[PDB]
Amino acid sequence: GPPFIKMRPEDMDAGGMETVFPWRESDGDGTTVESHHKLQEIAMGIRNPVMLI
């Protein structure tokens, strides 16, 4: 499955803690070598991760 999937507002709870990352739809899913490397690059970013409470 894709390393990252889109997020819906209904899919949360009153006390839910989740971790999200930028998607940039032009990236695409992890099928080709370039897309996989770009997904790994966005994964390895110090200032990328963001909480949504």
Partner: protein, 218 residues
Amino acid sequence: SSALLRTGKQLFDTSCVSCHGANLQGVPDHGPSLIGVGEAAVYFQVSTGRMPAMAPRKDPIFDEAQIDAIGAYVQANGGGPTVVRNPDGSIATQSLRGNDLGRGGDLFRLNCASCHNFTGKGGALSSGKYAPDLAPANEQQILTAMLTGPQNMPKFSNRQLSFEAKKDIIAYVKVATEARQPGGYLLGGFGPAPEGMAMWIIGMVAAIGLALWIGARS
């Protein structure tokens, strides 16, 4: 059933009415309303010994299948998540165990390890309450506790986490703690601070004893 549930919850006034009301209304001074949580919340909070206190784990109060009655009573009062049961009238024990481990381990290190520990031991929080060790945890209560959202713990919905994800998580949890450490005696699963304590208390003492034995004092 339902009448027996009322007997064991309300007529057994030792347990319910003194903190939440006969109609499960919830006295604002002491406890919550307790009207929207399902039978799973009661099952987890009762079967793990987190009974009314004066709240660390203790011995359970109700064990003789009346926990099912309490869960039926609370679910009839209000809807919510229910206990996953084996397809024979009992509670699932090994059917909940999954197969994948890498995804489960990654999910553990992404959301579980933060509070509890890297290896599932106790964790340290701020201002009193802490993170209990997962060693005395049993898989059904693990899943139910995640789905329930107990005190100070983020509540997790089945919508955001797949059922296969729960199976993988519990499989990884059971594998990590129950497997023998292939490095000799374990040192609590913490960082190098106990390692340094052990060096100072054993290596130093034996070394200076051998030095005194070999050497002479004058």
